[PDB]
Symmetry: C3
Subunit: 76 residues, 3 copies
């Protein structure tokens, strides 16, 4: 066991990468839905009003970099 540690660590890294990739994908969908429905509300109102748009550009790019960074922790 030093080889077994490295195996479990690489294995965990793969799971962590999937989790943040998936999280990033979910946030994109949330942004699109919230913003579509905000614009629909604004349009209906035209036919206060203070709606807000979601912008998660920074967060989504940051999650992508996190998955990238994890790639560099793998053990050959």
């Amino acid at each position: 066991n030093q080889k077994l540690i490295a195996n479990k660590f690489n294995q965990a890294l793969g799971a962590m990468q999937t989790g943040f990739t998936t999280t990033n994908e979910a946030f994109q969908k949330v942004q699109d839905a919230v913003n579509n429905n905000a614009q629909a509300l604004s349009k209906l109102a035209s036919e206060q009003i203070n709606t807000t748009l979601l912008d998660l550009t920074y967060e989504m790019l940051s999650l992508q970099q996190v998955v990238k960074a994890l790639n560099e922790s793998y053990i050959d």
Copy 2:
């Protein structure tokens, strides 16, 4: 120290599992709220309109599998 490495790794794994479980729980709530409020908007409009529903089925199941996968990286 090889025992201390394994301890810190198991400890980190526990934190990672909690994080993705919590993230998964939050996404479920976001989906429910966004969709409830989209349906409320559609109903009000009936009384363009292009509202969108959130479906994060794939992402939430994927997060569950990630937490499952992490379980398999523990060191006895």
Copy 3:
């Protein structure tokens, strides 16, 4: 290599902390946008209706604790 394992592990921990911090930040923004737009909808309706508010207090605090817990897995 035992030093290389510890280095990659610390490196991965840093990435994991960033990911959950970023995720936590994104959820805060999602909560604010969804709730602002729910209140806007309620106001427009006043001028069923069953809108829902998002509260991710537990999840956001939990993510903060996860980042805290990860800090304690670092190897000197």
